[PDB]
Design an enzyme around this catalytic site. Structure first.
Site, PDB file in Angstrom:
ATOM      1  N   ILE A  69       0.820  -1.208   0.000  1.00  0.00           N
ATOM      2  CA  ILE A  69       0.000   0.000   0.000  1.00  0.00           C
ATOM      3  C   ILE A  69       0.856   1.260   0.000  1.00  0.00           C
ATOM      4  O   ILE A  69       0.509   2.251  -0.644  1.00  0.00           O
ATOM      5  CB  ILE A  69      -0.940   0.045   1.228  1.00  0.00           C
ATOM      6  CG1 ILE A  69      -1.934  -1.111   1.167  1.00  0.00           C
ATOM      7  CG2 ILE A  69      -1.688   1.372   1.264  1.00  0.00           C
ATOM      8  CD1 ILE A  69      -2.845  -1.199   2.382  1.00  0.00           C
ATOM      9  N   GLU A 109       4.791   3.255   1.934  1.00  0.00           N
ATOM     10  CA  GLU A 109       5.916   3.237   2.865  1.00  0.00           C
ATOM     11  C   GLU A 109       5.939   4.502   3.716  1.00  0.00           C
ATOM     12  O   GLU A 109       5.771   5.610   3.202  1.00  0.00           O
ATOM     13  CB  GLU A 109       7.253   3.150   2.122  1.00  0.00           C
ATOM     14  CG  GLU A 109       7.433   1.955   1.206  1.00  0.00           C
ATOM     15  CD  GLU A 109       8.879   1.797   0.752  1.00  0.00           C
ATOM     16  OE1 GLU A 109       9.487   2.803   0.326  1.00  0.00           O
ATOM     17  OE2 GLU A 109       9.408   0.667   0.819  1.00  0.00           O
ATOM     18  N   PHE A 164      -8.924  -3.007   7.375  1.00  0.00           N
ATOM     19  CA  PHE A 164      -8.691  -2.385   6.076  1.00  0.00           C
ATOM     20  C   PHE A 164      -9.813  -1.462   5.604  1.00  0.00           C
ATOM     21  O   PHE A 164     -10.987  -1.784   5.760  1.00  0.00           O
ATOM     22  CB  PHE A 164      -8.470  -3.482   5.027  1.00  0.00           C
ATOM     23  CG  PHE A 164      -8.212  -2.961   3.643  1.00  0.00           C
ATOM     24  CD1 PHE A 164      -9.251  -2.809   2.732  1.00  0.00           C
ATOM     25  CD2 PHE A 164      -6.926  -2.594   3.260  1.00  0.00           C
ATOM     26  CE1 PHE A 164      -9.011  -2.297   1.460  1.00  0.00           C
ATOM     27  CE2 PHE A 164      -6.678  -2.079   1.990  1.00  0.00           C
ATOM     28  CZ  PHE A 164      -7.720  -1.930   1.090  1.00  0.00           C
ATOM     29  N   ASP A 196      -8.455   6.942   1.290  1.00  0.00           N
ATOM     30  CA  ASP A 196      -8.138   7.954   2.291  1.00  0.00           C
ATOM     31  C   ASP A 196      -8.720   9.291   1.848  1.00  0.00           C
ATOM     32  O   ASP A 196      -9.107   9.458   0.685  1.00  0.00           O
ATOM     33  CB  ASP A 196      -6.622   8.055   2.561  1.00  0.00           C
ATOM     34  CG  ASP A 196      -5.811   8.453   1.338  1.00  0.00           C
ATOM     35  OD1 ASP A 196      -6.244   9.344   0.577  1.00  0.00           O
ATOM     36  OD2 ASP A 196      -4.714   7.883   1.156  1.00  0.00           O
ATOM     37  N   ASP A 244      -0.226  13.353  14.495  1.00  0.00           N
ATOM     38  CA  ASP A 244       0.084  13.556  13.085  1.00  0.00           C
ATOM     39  C   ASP A 244      -1.116  13.451  12.157  1.00  0.00           C
ATOM     40  O   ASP A 244      -1.082  12.727  11.158  1.00  0.00           O
ATOM     41  CB  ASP A 244       1.185  12.570  12.662  1.00  0.00           C
ATOM     42  CG  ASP A 244       1.823  12.932  11.328  1.00  0.00           C
ATOM     43  OD1 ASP A 244       1.875  14.135  10.993  1.00  0.00           O
ATOM     44  OD2 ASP A 244       2.295  12.011  10.621  1.00  0.00           O
TER      45      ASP A 244
HETATM   46  C1  LIG Z   1      -3.101   5.842   6.679  1.00  0.00           C
HETATM   47  O1  LIG Z   1      -3.325   4.627   7.436  1.00  0.00           O
HETATM   48  C2  LIG Z   1      -2.129   3.962   7.786  1.00  0.00           C
HETATM   49  C3  LIG Z   1      -0.852   4.640   7.863  1.00  0.00           C
HETATM   50  C4  LIG Z   1       0.329   3.933   8.224  1.00  0.00           C
HETATM   51  C5  LIG Z   1       0.266   2.540   8.521  1.00  0.00           C
HETATM   52  F1  LIG Z   1       1.370   1.899   8.857  1.00  0.00           F
HETATM   53  C6  LIG Z   1      -0.977   1.837   8.455  1.00  0.00           C
HETATM   54  F2  LIG Z   1      -0.994   0.538   8.740  1.00  0.00           F
HETATM   55  C7  LIG Z   1      -2.187   2.528   8.089  1.00  0.00           C
HETATM   56  C8  LIG Z   1      -3.430   1.793   8.018  1.00  0.00           C
HETATM   57  O2  LIG Z   1      -3.913   1.354   9.076  1.00  0.00           O
HETATM   58  C9  LIG Z   1      -4.114   1.591   6.750  1.00  0.00           C
HETATM   59  C10 LIG Z   1      -3.508   2.057   5.516  1.00  0.00           C
HETATM   60  N1  LIG Z   1      -4.075   1.917   4.358  1.00  0.00           N
HETATM   61  C11 LIG Z   1      -5.292   1.314   4.262  1.00  0.00           C
HETATM   62  N2  LIG Z   1      -5.919   1.165   3.061  1.00  0.00           N
HETATM   63  C12 LIG Z   1      -5.454   2.082   2.011  1.00  0.00           C
HETATM   64  C13 LIG Z   1      -5.974   1.554   0.649  1.00  0.00           C
HETATM   65  C14 LIG Z   1      -5.652   2.551  -0.484  1.00  0.00           C
HETATM   66  N3  LIG Z   1      -6.267   3.872  -0.174  1.00  0.00           N
HETATM   67  S1  LIG Z   1      -6.118   4.930  -1.492  1.00  0.00           S
HETATM   68  C15 LIG Z   1      -4.379   5.371  -1.843  1.00  0.00           C
HETATM   69  O3  LIG Z   1      -6.702   4.313  -2.651  1.00  0.00           O
HETATM   70  O4  LIG Z   1      -6.843   6.139  -1.171  1.00  0.00           O
HETATM   71  C16 LIG Z   1      -5.654   4.456   1.056  1.00  0.00           C
HETATM   72  C17 LIG Z   1      -5.963   3.544   2.263  1.00  0.00           C
HETATM   73  N4  LIG Z   1      -5.956   0.829   5.351  1.00  0.00           N
HETATM   74  C18 LIG Z   1      -5.401   0.948   6.604  1.00  0.00           C
HETATM   75  N5  LIG Z   1      -6.101   0.454   7.643  1.00  0.00           N
END
Ligand SMILES: COc1ccc(F)c(F)c1C(=O)c1cnc(NC2CCN(S(C)(=O)=O)CC2)nc1N
EC number: 2.7.11.22
Length: 284
Positions: free
Chosen positions: A10, A12, A70, A74, A115
């Protein structure tokens, strides 16, 4: 993580890589945060409808894995998809209200996020928005991490001025900046360095002094040599937001952390008199 099947990467972060993965034991689809090597254990208890659920925390062989529920998108991506037209006020209000509820909750338990930013706000098709990636007060830096321009845009002034023991007020400031961004479709204070960030804030809200912020001149990084900008007309900041919205925003952006509105009080602001929960149209 033998019980976890990676689906795709997803992204870094500075200290962790995030993957979409599948739990072989539950079939559950999750987000995994891999950090190369207690406060975290407490987060597993910080459960709220507007906080991304931390499903599990696994420490094995100099590796720390955080398993989160998940979500497909965002706020950053949604705003960009809505840049041409703008997120409808009702939805902006709903998202702001939900996040204020989430913050009122974590702050009541003495937990700060530290943050908040669009990419740390996850949304679903149910109209919910959730706080993600709560930060601590560790690990091996990811060498391939690419610099992000939005990194300092939501930083409260007390952090930039070197406050070592800042309060829950920093989250309110960040959320206020996000609120302004949803309304105007442009970042409020897009600085690319700590000093540029500070000065952009100063240019709009005026250079703080003892009058509006008692104790500011004694802060770690405060400099008497800071240029003196006069606060500009606030109606210039988030047009065409109505006075209820501008009023709330101004209280979320007060320089003095002690004067800045709390999440709890913000929920009672007249701006939310007509709050509803709209269903956003998301393209996944
Ligand atoms: C921002 O959230 C996090 C930040 C750092 C981290 F280490 C994490 F594990 C997370 C986190 O819990 C997390 C991160 N991403 C996602 N799903 C993504 C799928 C792609 N969308 S997108 C690009 O299509 O809009 C953005 C959100 N689900 C989550 N549950």
């Amino acid at each position: 993580m033998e019980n976890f099947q990676k689906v795709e990467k997803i992204g870094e972060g500075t200290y962790g890589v995030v993957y979409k993965a599948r739990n072989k034991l539950t079939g559950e689809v999750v987000a995994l945060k891999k950090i190369r090597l207690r406060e975290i254990s407490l987060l597993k208890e910080l459960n709220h409808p507007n906080i991304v659920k931390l499903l599990d925390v696994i420490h094995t062989e100099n590796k720390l894995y955080l398993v989160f529920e998940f979500l497909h998108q965002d706020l950053k991506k949604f705003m960009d998809a809505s840049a041409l037209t703008g997120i409808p006020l009702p939805l902006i209000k709903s998202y702001l209200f939900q996040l204020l509820q989430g913050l009122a909750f974590c702050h009541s338990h003495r937990v700060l996020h530290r943050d908040l930013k669009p990419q740390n706000l996850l949304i679903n098709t149910e109209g919910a928005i959730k706080l993600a990636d709560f930060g601590l007060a560790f690990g091996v830096p990811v060498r391939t991490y690419t610099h992000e321009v939005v990194t300092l845009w939501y930083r409260a002034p007390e952090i930039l001025l070197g406050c070592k023991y800042y309060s829950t007020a920093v989250d309110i400031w960040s959320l206020g900046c996000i609120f302004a961004e949803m309304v105007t479709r442009r970042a409020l204070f897009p600085g690319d360095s700590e000093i540029d960030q500070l000065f952009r804030i100063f240019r709009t809200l005026g250079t703080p002094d003892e009058v509006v912020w008692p104790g500011v001149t004694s802060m770690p990084d405060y400099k008497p040599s800071f240029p003196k900008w006069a606060r500009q007309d606030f109606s210039k900041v988030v047009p065409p937001l109505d006075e209820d919205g501008r009023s709330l925003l101004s209280q979320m952006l007060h320089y003095d952390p002690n004067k800045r509105i709390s999440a709890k009080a913000a929920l009672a602001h007249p701006f939310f008199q007509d709050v509803t929960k709209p269903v956003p149209h998301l393209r996944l």
